[PDB]
Write a protein that binds this ligand. Structure first.
Ligand code: ATP
Ligand code: MN
Ligand code: MN
Ligand code: MN
Length: 335
């Protein structure tokens, strides 16, 4: 949902820059031209990671940022700082889009506006030979951002969440379905070869044997991190897998934080040395999105580096979200 119709929230002036002002859009804050919106006005909000194909009539404000990306000319939206003011996304009034004049607030207009997703380059050894599609009987590893979850954050006041450090690597799934055990990246099941990093990590921590021991239809989902993976923020030597979720294939449901933690303990008790993403204290939710984003900055798995952020998974395993550190996004312009 890169481009959606949203509502201008609080509009606050930026001291010393009378030509612009700060617009809150859900949990995001975004610099607009002074007077472009009033609180309550609707517009199209384009999230960071939007890639907006070149168009100086509709998008002249992006003109000097046009780059070549996957053979297209256009602009990547990313976190910026303007006059000391944090700015994320692009927010344009509805009258700039006459073809949306009878759409509704909340509508996803990504496809109609031709917006595509920008992503960092995938790391060398994490692209292997493809064996097949990512299994349709396993959920992929996505997380919604807290900035997009204002009402849900409200409903969940008092609920308890497992808090884990978000690790900056590549998503990796190792699973068992009856007589088949497979290793996947984010979007594909991979063939075992000598150079495949994901298979190597699954063999080295004995997690294939661990799945054979547990004898259940489970998908172990985690982050492979380390050297030549997204710049190796943790300064690891070699590479390693860090579990964050277990999907129950037979029940088509994630395991709860407590079910997952005890299964990981049994694996390690039996010699299967599967590591887990860092687990912090459980959080009783009673927070605004702004407050959640403030906890996002802090120590990573390597305590001497600042983390990508935090993932919150409710104790029933049925509601999860991610809070990315904005200091992290400011420091790492390649993501
Ligand atoms: N502790 C954690 N819990 C859950 N996921 C984690 C954790 N640490 C790292 N991750 C990664 O976070 C990803 C979900 O976050 P997010 O939706 O931001 O994904 P993404 O790869 O950044 O995609 P995009 O950039 O397109 O939104 C997962 O796919 C997983 O690889
Ligand atoms: Mn991204
Ligand atoms: Mn995502
Ligand atoms: Mn990531």
């Amino acid at each position: 949902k890169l481009a959606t119709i949203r509502t201008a929230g609080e509009i606050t002036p930026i001291a010393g820059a009378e030509a612009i002002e700060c617009c809150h859009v859900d949990g995001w804050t975004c610099v607009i031209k002074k007077g472009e919106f009033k609180q309550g006005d609707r517009g199209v909000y384009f999230e960071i990671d939007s890639f907006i194909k070149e168009d100086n009539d509709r998008y002249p404000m992006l003109s000097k940022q046009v780059i070549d990306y996957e053979g297209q000319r256009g602009t990547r939206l990313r976190t910026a700082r303007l006059r000391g003011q944090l700015s994320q996304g692009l927010f344009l009034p509805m009258d700039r889009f006459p073809e949306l004049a009878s759409n509704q607030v909340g509508d996803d207009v990504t496809e109609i506006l031709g917006i595509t997703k920008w992503e960092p380059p995938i790391s060398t050894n994490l692209s292997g030979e493809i064996l097949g599609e990512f299994p349709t009987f396993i959920s992929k590893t996505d997380q919604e951002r807290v900035q997009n979850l204002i009402p849900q954050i409200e409903e969940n006041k008092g609920q308890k969440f497992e808090v884990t450090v978000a690790l900056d690597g590549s998503s990796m799934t190792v699973y068992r379905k009856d007589d088949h055990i497979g290793v996947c990246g984010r979007n594909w099941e991979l063939r075992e070869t000598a150079t495949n990093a994901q298979w190597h990590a699954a063999r080295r921590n004995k997690m294939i044997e661990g799945l054979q021991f547990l004898n259940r239809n489970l998908a172990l989902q985690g982050e492979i991190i380390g050297e030549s993976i997204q710049g190796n923020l943790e300064k690891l030597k070699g590479q390693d897998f860090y579990l964050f979720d277990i999907y129950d294939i037979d029940k088509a449901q994630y395991l709860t934080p407590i079910e997952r933690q005890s299964l990981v303990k049994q694996l390690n008790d039996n010699g299967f040395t599967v590591k887990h993403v860092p687990i912090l204290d459980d959080l009783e939710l009673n927070h605004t999105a702004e407050q959640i984003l403030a906890m996002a900055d802090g120590p990573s798995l390597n305590k001497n580096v600042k983390r990508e952020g935090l993932v919150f998974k409710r104790l029933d395993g049925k509601f999860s979200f991610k809070a990315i550190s904005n200091a992290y996004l400011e420091k790492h312009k390649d993501r």
